[PDB]
Structures are given as C-alpha cells and as structure tokens.
Amino acid sequence: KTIIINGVQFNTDEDTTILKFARDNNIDISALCFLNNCNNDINKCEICTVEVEGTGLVTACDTLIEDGMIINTNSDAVNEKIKSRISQLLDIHEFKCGPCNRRENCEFLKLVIKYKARASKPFLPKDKTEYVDERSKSLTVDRTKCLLCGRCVNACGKNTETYAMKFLNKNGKTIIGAEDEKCFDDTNCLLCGQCIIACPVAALSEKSHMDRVKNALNAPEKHVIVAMAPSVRASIGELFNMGFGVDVTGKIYTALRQLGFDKIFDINFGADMTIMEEATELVQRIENNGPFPMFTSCCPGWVRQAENYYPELLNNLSSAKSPQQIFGTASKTYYPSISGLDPKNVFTVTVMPCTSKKFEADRPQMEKDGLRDIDAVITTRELAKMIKDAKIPFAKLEDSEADPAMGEYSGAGAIFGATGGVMEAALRSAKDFAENAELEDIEYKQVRGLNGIKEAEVEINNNKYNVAVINGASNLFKFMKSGMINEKQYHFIEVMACHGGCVNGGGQPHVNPKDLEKVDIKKVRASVLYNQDEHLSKRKSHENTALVKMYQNYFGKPGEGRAHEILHFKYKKSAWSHPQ
Numbered sequence: 001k002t003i004i005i006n007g008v009q010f011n012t013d014e015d016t017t018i019l020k021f022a023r024d025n026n027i028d029i030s031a032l033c034f035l036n037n038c039n040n041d042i043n044k045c046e047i048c049t050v051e052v053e054g055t056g057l058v059t060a061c062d063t064l065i066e067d068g069m070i071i072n073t074n075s076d077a078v079n080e081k082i083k084s085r086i087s088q089l090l091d092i093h094e095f096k097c098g099p100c101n102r103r104e105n106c107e108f109l110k111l112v113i114k115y116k117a118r119a120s121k122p123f124l125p126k127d128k129t130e131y132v133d134e135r136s137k138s139l140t141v142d143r144t145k146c147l148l149c150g151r152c153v154n155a156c157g158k159n160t161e162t163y164a165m166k167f168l169n170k171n172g173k174t175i176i177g178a179e180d181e182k183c184f185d186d187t188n189c190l191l192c193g194q195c196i197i198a199c200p201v202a203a204l205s206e207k208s209h210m211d212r213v214k215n216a217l218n219a220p221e222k223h224v225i226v227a228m229a230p231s232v233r234a235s236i237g238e239l240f241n242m243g244f245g246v247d248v249t250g251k252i253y254t255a256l257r258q259l260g261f262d263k264i265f266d267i268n269f270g271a272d273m274t275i276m277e278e279a280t281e282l283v284q285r286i287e288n289n290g291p292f293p294m295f296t297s298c299c300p301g302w303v304r305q306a307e308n309y310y311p312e313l314l315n316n317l318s319s320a321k322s323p324q325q326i327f328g329t330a331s332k333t334y335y336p337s338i339s340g341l342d343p344k345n346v347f348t349v350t351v352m353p354c355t356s357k358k359f360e361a362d363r364p365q366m367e368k369d370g371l372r373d374i375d376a377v378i379t380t381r382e383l384a385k386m387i388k389d390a391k392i393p394f395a396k397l398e399d400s401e402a403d404p405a406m407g408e409y410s411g412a413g414a415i416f417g418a419t420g421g422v423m424e425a426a427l428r429s430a431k432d433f434a435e436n437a438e439l440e441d442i443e444y445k446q447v448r449g450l451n452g453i454k455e456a457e458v459e460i461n462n463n464k465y466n467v468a469v470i471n472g473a474s475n476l477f478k479f480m481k482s483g484m485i486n487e488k489q490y491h492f493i494e495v496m497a498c499h500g501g502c503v504n505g506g507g508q509p510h511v512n513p514k515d516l517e518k519v520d521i522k523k524v525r526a527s528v529l530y531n532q533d534e535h536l537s538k539r540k541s542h543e544n545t546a547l548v549k550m551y552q553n554y555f556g557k558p559g560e561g562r563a564h565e566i567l568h569f570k571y572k573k574s575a576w577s578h579p580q
C-alpha cells in the first residue's frame with residue numbers, strides 16, 4: 001500500500017488502522033474511547049478524527065489503511081472537530097480537578113489542555129448525591145465525571161465476559177452501571193475492578209476505606225497492624241514517578257511507619273500460611289484419591305464467579321482462607337498471644353492491588369468472637385494517596401524491614417501476585433509434604449506467564465497429576481464452557497480473576513494507554529516478584545522460620561485441629577428451592 005500522512009509517503013503491506021499505523025510511525029493522533037483494541041461502537045468519541053482526502057473526516061481508531069489514502073491529522077478542520085467533541089464532554093463533566101482523585105494522571109484533563117477546550121456551559125450539579133453510587137463494598141461510581149466512553153463496559157466484557165458493567169437507560173438518559181441499576185454486589189459482578197482500571201477519568205473508583213484507617217490510627221487505644229499484598233511492592237513506585245518494575249518493598253515499610261501504623265507485617269506471611277494449609281489439603285485429597293479437582297480460593301473475584309456462575313464447584317474450593325483473611329484471623333488470635341495486646345484493640349489493615357478484597361474482608365462470617373479477621377483494606381492507589389497527603393517523600397526514603405513475627409516470607413509467598421504463583425508455591429510444599437523430602441528442583445516454569453489457560457503434568461510420589469492455571473475470569477468461562485475441564489482429570493486448579501494475576505488487579509495504579517504500548521505491565525510487575533523469589537534464602541512456605549514458630553507454638557499441625565477450626569472457610573451453594 002502507498003499511504004500519505006501529513007505529506008509523508010509510506011509504503012506498507014500492513015493491514016491495520018490509521019491510528020495504529022500512525023502510532024507505529026510516531027505520528028500523533030489523539031484517542032479517548034479506544035482501548036483494549038476496541039472503541040465505543042455506539043456514540044464514538046471521535047477524538048481520533050483525521051481527514052482522508054476524497055472521503056472527509058474519519059475515525060482513525062477503527063478505519064483501516066488503504067492503498068492511495070492521503071491523510072491529514074492536524075488540519076484546522078480536524079482540530080476544530082476534536083476540540084468540539086471535548087467541549088461537548090466538558091458540558092457533561094464536573095471539571096473540578098483540585099480535589100479529584102485522578103488529578104495527577106487523568107487522560108481527559110490532558111486532552112482538554114492539549115486542545116484548549118472549554119465547556120459551552122459549565123457542568124455544575126448541586127445535588128451530587130444523585131450522580132454517585134457508593135452502595136458497593138468494593139466499587140463506586142461518580143457519574144459527574146463519566147464521559148460515556150464505554151471503556152469500562154468493553155473491559156468488563158473482554159476481561160470477565162460477565163458484562164456486569166452495562167449501558168443503561170435511566171429516565172431517558174444514558175448511564176453506565178450494573179444490571180437494573182442495582183448495587184454491583186447484588187449482581188453477577190466479580191468486583192474485580194477491571195472497569196476502574198479502564199476508566200480514563202475519576203468516574204469509577206474503589207470504595208474508600210481511608211477513613212476507617214485514619215480513624216483507627218488516631219484512636220488512642222487501637223493497635224493498628226498493616227500488611228501489604230505481594231503486588232504492592234512491585235507497583236506503587238509508579239505513582240511516585242519511579243518508573244515501572246521497581247522493587248520498593250523497603251520504602252513501603254518506612255512510609256507505613258511514618259504514617260503511624262503500630263506494627264508492620266506482610267501478607268506474604270499470610271501467603272505462606274495459605275500454602276501450609278492448602279498444600280496439606282492437596283496431599284490429603286491425593287491420599288484419599290479425591291475429591292478432584294481442588295480449586296484455589298484465594299482470589300475473591302473467582303470466588304464470586306464460582307458463587308454466581310458455578311455454585312457446583314464451591315465444594316471443590318480449598319477450605320484454606322486467603323492470605324489476607326488467614327493473616328487477619330491470626331492477627332486477632334496468635335498475635336495477641338505473643339504481644340499482650342487485647343484482641344479487641346487490634347485493628348488489622350491490608351494494602352491490596354484489589355477491589356474485590358474489600359468485599360472479602362466484609363463478608364459477615366469472616367470474624368470470630370466478634371472480631372473481624374480484617375478491619376480495613378486499602379488499595380495501592382489509596383496507600384499512594386495517604387503517603388502523598390502526609391507529605392512523605394517516598395522516592396527518597398531509606399529502606400526499613402518488616403516486624404518479623406508475621407512479616408517474614410519465603411520466595412513461594414513472594415510470587416503469589418503473578419498468575420501461576422499460587423500454583424508454583426503450592427507445588428513446592430505439596431511435593432515435599434507428600435514425599436517427606438526436601439527437594440531441590442522447585443521452579444515450575446510451565447505454569448508461569450500470560451497464556452490464558454496453562455496446564456502441566458506433575459509427578460508427586462511417583463504418581464502423575466494434572467494441574468491447570470486459569471489466568472483471567474474470561475478464561476475460566478472458556479475453560480468450563482468449552483468442556484476443557486473434561487479432557488482429563490484435573491487434580492489442582494488455580495484461578496485468578498485478573499489476567500496476569502494480582503499484579504494487574506483493580507486497585508492498582510492506572511497506566512496511560514501509551515505507556516501500556518511501551519511496557520508489558522503484567523510481566524514487568526511480576527518480574528519484581530520472581531526476582532525476590534530467586535534471591536530469597538527460603539523458597540518454600542514451610543521453611544518460613546516465623547511461620548514454623550507460629551504453628552509449633554500456637555496452631556499445631558496444619559490442616560487439622562485448631563488450624564482447621566480457625567484458619568479455614570467453606571463456601572456453600574444455596575439449597576434447592578422453588579421458585580428460584
């Protein structure tokens with residue numbers, strides 16, 4: 001093909017869109033509703049408008065290049081059209097960046113500045129409450145910011161195939177929201193927050209727990225524990241202009257102390273706990289030749305997916321609590337026993353890459369003796385905001401260490417945040433347990449990486465077993481609906497709702513679409529975790545010295561007795577009833 005763009009001739013055999021071709025050749029074309037290889041097919045934003053001679057104005061993001069095209073991306077006519085569209089969006093946008101939670105990384109603001117757009121009539125609603133939906137334990141909607149770009153609807157469809165995020169007709173006007181404008185939690189929504197990650201503006205957010213946290217920190221009698229997820233140490237640096245793939249574990253520990261938390265632990269310790277219990281359960285099911293398969297239960301997006309779409313599998317889920325909840329349980333029982341704290345005064349906070357974890361923490365039965373396992377969950381984004389509000393110079397902080405009693409972790413625990421991480425970690429322990437051995441080959445590279453569905457055959461005690469790693473909620477649907485689950489007997493299956501695993505969770509830093517083209521965010525974030533695993537002396541959960549002490553002195557034998565009583569949680573399908 002011969003293509004002319006802004007007077008420059010290109011000869012190409014590529015079959016692609018004007019936008020992609022332009023961007024591959026460093027020609028600037030703006031875009032808004034285009035993301036994840038799709039745009040908003042109904043009511044296109046047209047921010048990607050270009051001019052094609054003999055055709056007129058076209059949308060670059062969904063128009064294929066053709067031999068003979070002569071394209072202008074920067075004519076007066078083009079720029080006036082784009083400016084007009086942005087002005088029209090400003091007419092439905094509460095343009096008050098000052099207090100806005102996307103102030104520092106908003107795509108819309110950048111477009112407004114670029115084209116110097118202005119509303120025809122400022123959008124200034126007085127009763128914001130009718131634009132806001134805060135009913136969910138996990139998600140919140142602020143429709144005064146919504147551009148109706150459809151990126152959330154498209155991302156939900158692509159990432160989960162639930163289509164829980166929909167366009168709705170609300171009293172004659174178009175909004176996005178859940179089915180029948182219900183609270184997301186009361187629908188088939190997984191609360192995974194991929195819709196948030198896709199949002200260019202501050203219209204979708206996590207349900208804030210920041211006041212729970214501040215209130216607890218300032219309560220004189222509360223002893224506030226904080227523990228961060230595997231993925232936080234691989235990602236939060238992004239929001240402090242430190243770049244991608246930077247391990248900031250030590251800086252986080254320092255920042256948390258400077259924020260006034262009373263104890264600095266780590267959810268990776270909880271991950272090693274989950275493996276103790278789950279590997280023990282796996283070895284049990286083997287020795288009892290069933291039931292199979294066993295599914296992981298540490299992803300609450302997946303648990304909701306099972307609850308909402310596959311209730312028949314709930315009995316197959318591992319009974320071990322997730323690292324967050326298992327940690328939380330121990331923080332109200334074991335931790336008082338080694339500290340003297342009154343359990344009622346312990347307030348346990350996690351920092352997560354995840355919105356669905358907020359729902360998990362607030363499940364009514366996730367408590368014992370009136371004490372919540374977990375009292376608050378803040379996302380990576382929320383912690384970043386707390387750090388900046390406190391004027392803590394994150395990038396400049398010295399490294400400190402976690403408090404060890406519930407802060408040590410093995411390399412198995414460290415890799416939980418990547419797809420296949422739980423699987424690999426679990427196998428390292430299950431194989432040692434089953435064979436009564438200390439095996440040296442512990443790297444299961446077959447279950448790593450970004451393939452949607454990953455399988456491996458593993459040898460445990462001279463019998464062969466089949467494992468699968470399901471990488472993304474859409475791939476769970478593919479795995480089940482396609483009958484893949486019946487090609488062979490699976491014994492142990494990992495499921496993560498977010499593709500890439502938790503490093504790509506719904507509570508993570510937003511990444512602007514251009515950076516996403518430059519950087520494989522899923523692999524770069526995961527690389528930090530695998531690097532930790534490689535350089536840790538202990539690489540099996542059951543070699544965690546603090547964990548071993550905890551079990552020896554407090555819980556006893558994993559998978560039975562006190563451990564089973566306290567550290568496990570079973571989900572139940574509803575009993576048959578009519579009408580349904």
Ligand code: SF4
Pocket residue numbers: 093094095096097100101102103104106107108109145201202203
């Ligand atoms: S969403 Fe963006 S443009 Fe709108 S108020 Fe917030 S920062 Fe400003």
Ligand code: SF4
Pocket residue numbers: 139155156157159160162163164165184188189190191192193194195196
């Ligand atoms: S939280 Fe996940 S399942 Fe629910 S609407 Fe958003 S993307 Fe869809």
Ligand code: SF4
Pocket residue numbers: 145146147148149150151152153176198199200201203204
């Ligand atoms: S909530 Fe965000 S992604 Fe969804 S339509 Fe509104 S602005 Fe677009």
Ligand code: SF4
Pocket residue numbers: 191192298299300301302353354355356357496497498501502503504505506
């Ligand atoms: S994959 Fe991780 S971040 Fe995503 S829903 Fe599951 S637990 Fe949350």
Ligand code: FES
Pocket residue numbers: 030031032033034039040044045046047048049059060061062
């Ligand atoms: S970016 Fe092309 S129509 Fe929206």
Ligand SMILES: [Mg+2]
Pocket residue numbers: 038039040041062
């Ligand atoms: Mg399209």
Ligand SMILES: [Mg+2]
Pocket residue numbers: 216217218219220222224260
């Ligand atoms: Mg305090």
